[PDB]
């Protein structure tokens, strides 16, 4: 349940920054492209967010949960789902940047849990990932 989409996304985001880590491919491609477009368009916002983010082992779980709860406070939509994935990427990149790479595995798990428990119903009820591909393809 959703581990693969998260794992392939985070692997890609980290690889884009020079770090090696470790349903169908059109979905993973579309998400990569959407995320990339989003981070390019909002490059300064993302750079400043990366900067200002507070991150340690003891605070990371609460930081992720709080951000993601606020992101979806008003409901789910695809643009917010893309931001979610991109924010998971930011946290993972910063984790590695700040010599806290042990957090990557945890962040990926939190992302998969959140998809499974909190985004799955909206995605299921709004045409699934195929709809995402139709919107962004």
């Amino acid at each position: 349940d959703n581990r693969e989409i998260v794992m392939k996304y985070i692997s890609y985001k980290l690889s884009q920054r020079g770090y090696e880590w470790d349903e169908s491919e059109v979905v993973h491609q579309t998400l990569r492209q959407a995320g990339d477009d989003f981070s390019l368009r909002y490059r300064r916002d993302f750079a400043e967010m990366s900067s200002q983010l507070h991150l340690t082992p003891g605070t990371a779980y609460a930081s992720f949960a709080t951000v993601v709860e606020e992101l979806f406070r008003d409901g789910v939509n695809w643009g917010r789902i893309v931001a979610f994935f991109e924010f998971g990427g930011v946290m993972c990149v910063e984790s590695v940047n700040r010599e806290m790479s042990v957090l990557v595995d945890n962040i990926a798990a939190w992302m998969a849990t959140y998809l499974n428990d909190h985004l799955h119903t909206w995605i299921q009820d709004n045409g699934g990932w195929d709809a995402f591909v139709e919107l962004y393809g």
């Binding site: 909002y42 606020e70 992101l71 643009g79």
Partner: peptide, 19 residues
């Protein structure tokens, strides 16, 4: 407290999404 900085990041992110 530390909730507050993270809450504001989340709002920034939501607003970027909705843009």
């Amino acid at each position: 407290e530390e909730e507050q900085w993270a809450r504001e990041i989340g709002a920034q992110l939501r607003r970027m999404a909705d843009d």
